[PDB]
Symmetry: none
Subunit: 92 residues, 5 copies
């Protein structure tokens, strides 16, 4: 093994659990607009975990732009540009 290496390794185990019954679950989701409502009856919850964004790795024994967007909000980007740019984010 020699050189660059980006490794994402996640080990998750949910095995050997007992959940008893007789449960009453009433879930009301209504009139949601541009939303992601989450809910429920859980015992073991593993979620939204293990995120890896790689980076610069240069191994040696013209405009470059690299953008990694994970679950993010990016608006109004003019990198390495020539001219005039107008970005208006007025909130009233």
């Amino acid at each position: 093994n020699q050189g660059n290496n980006q490794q994402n390794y996640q080990q998750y185990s949910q095995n050997g659990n007992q959940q008893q019954g007789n449960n009453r679950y009433q879930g009301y989701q209504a009139y949601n607009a541009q939303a992601q409502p989450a809910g429920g009856y859980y015992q073991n919850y593993q979620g939204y975990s293990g995120y890896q964004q790689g980076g610069y790795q240069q191994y040696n024994p013209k405009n470059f732009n690299y953008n990694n967007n994970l679950q993010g909000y990016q608006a109004g980007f003019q990198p390495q540009s020539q001219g005039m740019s107008l970005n208006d984010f007025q909130k009233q």
Copy 2:
């Protein structure tokens, strides 16, 4: 093994669980607009996990643009451009 390497390795186990019955589940989802409502009756929940975005890896013993968008919002992008650009994000 020699050179660049991007590896996504996820191991998940849900094996050996007991869920008892006699359960009452009433789920009401209505009048959702541009939404992703999530719910339910769960015991072991593994989700939205293990995301890997690769990066720059250069191994050596003109405009370049690389964009990785995972579950993201990207609006108004003019990288490495020449001229004039108008991006208007007014909210009233």
Copy 3:
């Protein structure tokens, strides 16, 4: 093995579980517009996991644009362009 390598390896196991019965499931989904409502009765849930987006890998012992969009929102893109561009995102 020598050179670039992008590998997505996911191992998932749900084997050896017991789910008891006598369950009452009432699910009401109605009047959803441009929506993806999710629900149900679950014991072991593995979903929306294991996403890999490859990256730059250059092994050596004119406009280039590379865009990877996974479950994302991309609007108003003018990379490496010459001229004038108007992108209007007014919300009233």
Copy 4:
């Protein structure tokens, strides 16, 4: 083995489970417009998992555009263009 390599390897097992009966499932889906409603009675759910988007891999011991869109929304794209472009996303 030598050179570029993009490999998607997913192993999923649901074998050896017991689901007891006597279940009552009432599912009501109606008046959905441009929607994908999901629901049901589940024990082991594996879905929407294991997505791989390849990337740049260059092995060496004029306008290029590469776009990978997986379950994404892309509107208003004018990469590597010359002229004037108007993209209007007004919401009222």
Copy 5:
């Protein structure tokens, strides 16, 4: 083995399960417009998994456009074009 290689390998097993009977399934789907409603009575569900989109792979020891769209929404694309383009996405 030498050169570029894109391989999609998925192994899924659901073998050795017991599902007991005496079940009552009432499913009502009506008045859906431009929709894909999904539901039912399940034990082992494997679906919408294992998607691979290949990428750039160049092995060496004028306008090019490559677009891969999987279950995606692409509207208003004018890459590597000369002139004027109007794309109007007004929602009222």
